[PDB]
């Protein structure tokens, strides 16, 4: 998914990276939608159906 979101992106869509360097650790778009919620975490359901 991280590879997909950074495919064919330009300056018009803003990308702001984070400090960790982990996959899906950036803010994207003018509204700055945080993409860290889509990383897997088994303690509580995030980024999946539950």
């Amino acid at each position: 998914l991280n590879d997909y979101l950074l495919y064919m992106y330009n300056t018009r869509v803003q990308v702001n990276y984070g400090p960790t360097g982990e996959p899906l650790d950036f803010q994207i778009g003018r509204n700055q939608y945080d993409c860290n919620v889509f990383r897997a975490d088994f303690a509580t359901g995030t980024g999946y159906n539950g």
Partner: protein, 50 residues
């Protein structure tokens, strides 16, 4: 980053997709140099640095 900032998108994405091929090729080169070309005919360190 420079390619994206300059309005080049297609070839920026092309390089981003071609990265694993590049990494595999250079890993093969490193392996060959480190584990095949080791002999007394290899250049000494004092000359390699100079």
């Amino acid at each position: 980053r420079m390619l994206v900032a300059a309005g080049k998108d297609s070839e920026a994405a092309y390089f981003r997709s071609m990265l694993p091929f590049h990494m595999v090729r250079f890993a093969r080169i490193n392996q060959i140099i480190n584990e095949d070309l080791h002999s007394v005919f290899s250049l000494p360190d004092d000359m390699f640095n100079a």
